[PDB]
Swiss-Prot record:
Highest taxon, organism lineage: Bacteria
CDD domains, per database record: YihA_EngB
Gene Ontology terms for molecular function: GTP binding; metal ion binding
Organism: Thermotoga maritima (strain ATCC 43589 / DSM 3109 / JCM 10099 / NBRC 100826 / MSB8)
Functional note: Necessary for normal cell division and for the maintenance of normal septation.
Pfam families reported for this sequence: MMR_HSR1
Keyword Magnesium: yes
UniProt domain EngB-type G: residue ranges: 21-172
Chain positions recorded as GTP binding sites: 29-36, 60-63, 120-123, 152-154
InterPro entries: G_ENGB_dom, GTP-bd, GTP-bd_ribosome_bio_YsxC, P-loop_NTPase, Small_GTP-bd
Protein name per its UniProtKB record: Probable GTP-binding protein EngB
Family: Belongs to the TRAFAC class TrmE-Era-EngA-EngB-Septin-like GTPase superfamily. EngB GTPase family.
């Protein structure tokens, strides 16, 4: 699916977004959630726009005072970019969901923005705690709806195949 990847646009305001093409997905989560390693594992190599295959975008959203800057930035994208097919919400698999994670879920719901939960850092979860940590995520998010939750690791490759297959379905 992924063959060519180029960072083509760094946007500080909505007037800065490149023309919609043949598809678009985005990625967001807390700072230090492992978003960069994830994108790298996927690519296998402000709002930043990566041209993929010359016809789609993978959008790298800012990780969450400067708080209001981040706030306006993401909101203008969500409310103005109707060609957004899916937001991947990355949450640290090592701890229970964060208040701010649940707020993103609620916020995305009010705008009818489709999203998929992605658990990161699963290779850092101890054998004996994988179970307890997994339902903490499923039990908490499921009180907002019935969402797709993909356990992933950019180190072991867990979930990457499925994330890639989901993204191919959406865009192709």
């Amino acid at each position: 699916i992924i063959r060519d990847v180029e960072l083509v646009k760094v946007a500080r305001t909505p007037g800065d977004y490149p023309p919609p093409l043949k598809g678009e997905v985005a990625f967001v989560g807390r700072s230090n959630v492992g978003k960069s390693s994830l994108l790298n594992a996927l690519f296998n190599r402000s709002i930043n726009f990566y041209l993929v295959n010359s016809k789609y975008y993978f959008v790298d959203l800012p990780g969450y005072k400067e708080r209001m800057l981040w706030k306006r930035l993401v909101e203008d994208y969500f409310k103005n970019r109707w060609s957004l097919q899916m937001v991947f919400l990355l949450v640290d698999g090592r701890i229970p969901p964060q208040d701010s994670d649940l707020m993103m879920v609620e916020w995305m719901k009010s705008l009818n923005i489709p999203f998929t939960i992605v658990l990161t850092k699963m290779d850092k979860v101890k054998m004996s705690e994988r179970a307890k940590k997994l339902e903490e995520h499923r039990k908490v998010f499921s009180k907002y709806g019935e969402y797709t939750i993909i356990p992933t690791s950019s180190v072991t490759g867990e979930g990457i195949s499925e994330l890639l297959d989901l993204i191919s379905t959406l865009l192709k």
